[PDB]
């Protein structure tokens, strides 16, 4: 599987066997992500939230054709150690899926 993240953790990704790339702007993140979508290989791409909060919104026209690629957003290296509540992400997820806001 591939993962777009900060350059610091890219060496650790390469050590663990993960395909890591280092980038800091949304433009290159989206272009590289759709390049990973079109290219043959692993179908899973992991995204740091600092570059692209919703990768499905980036590939929404490639997602309408095929739903086999898998995308996963996660906190970046700086956001990881300072931390946050993941339950806000859960509330946003359920509010997106149903269209309804409940169970804070």
């Amino acid at each position: 599987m591939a993962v777009i993240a900060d350059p610091e953790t890219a060496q650790g990704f390469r050590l663990a066997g993960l395909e890591g790339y280092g980038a800091s702007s949304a433009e290159e993140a989206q272009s590289l992500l759709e390049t990973l979508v079109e290219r043959g290989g692993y179908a899973l791409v992991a995204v740091d939230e600092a570059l692209l909060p919703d990768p499905e919104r980036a590939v929404e026209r490639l997602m309408r054709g095929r739903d086999l690629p898998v995308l996963l957003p996660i906190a970046g290296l700086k956001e990881a150690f300072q931390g946050h509540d993941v339950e806000g992400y859960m509330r946003e997820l359920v509010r997106k899926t149903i269209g309804f806001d409940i169970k804070l």
């Binding site: 953790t9 650790g12 050590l15 692993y42 990881a80 993941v86 997820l93 149903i98």
Partner: protein
């Protein structure tokens, strides 16, 4: 449609069929709602476990950078191959088929696995546990999203 008594009986039978179908679809939606709530609780738990594993893996990686040095880590990372134990499978959920991901990365796949750079080996350990939590999160969340779209179709 020509008005006859037989046609009237057939239309009333159709009306009863439609009402019974509406009730049955409501019951199905209720069951899907219960499954959705259970799955979203599981997904939240998996997400926070993944966050904790990611934090400690990054801490171990930074310590390995501090001790073993960038060149030794790069020499270790060059030898170790990328993910090759990949398996893709499909799973059924309420009549819909969804894909799942599988990873099997062992110690035998590594190149020079002896941990003389000990902190690099610790980083590899924590990254393996990180990968376990990550694949769990991926599967649970994609199942949750498919359940949500099923509920929308039923509504």
């Amino acid at each position: 449609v020509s008005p006859t008594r037989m046609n009237l009986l057939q239309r009333r039978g159709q009306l009863r069929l439609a009402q019974k179908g509406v009730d049955l679809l409501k019951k199905k939606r209720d069951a899907l709602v219960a499954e959705f709530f259970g799955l979203v609780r599981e997904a939240m738990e998996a997400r926070k476990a993944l966050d904790q594993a990611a934090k400690e893996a990054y801490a171990a990686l930074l310590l390995a950078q501090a001790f073993d040095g960038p060149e030794v880590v790069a020499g270790a990372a060059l030898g170790v191959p990328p993910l090759e134990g990949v398996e893709a499978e499909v799973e059924n959920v309420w009549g819909s088929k969804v894909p799942r991901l599988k990873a099997t990365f062992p110690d035998g796949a590594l190149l020079s696995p002896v941990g003389t750079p000990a902190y690099t080996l610790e980083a590899s350990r924590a990254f393996r546990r990180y990968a376990e939590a990550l694949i769990r999160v991926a599967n649970t969340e994609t199942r949750l999203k498919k359940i949500g779209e099923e509920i929308k179709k039923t509504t």
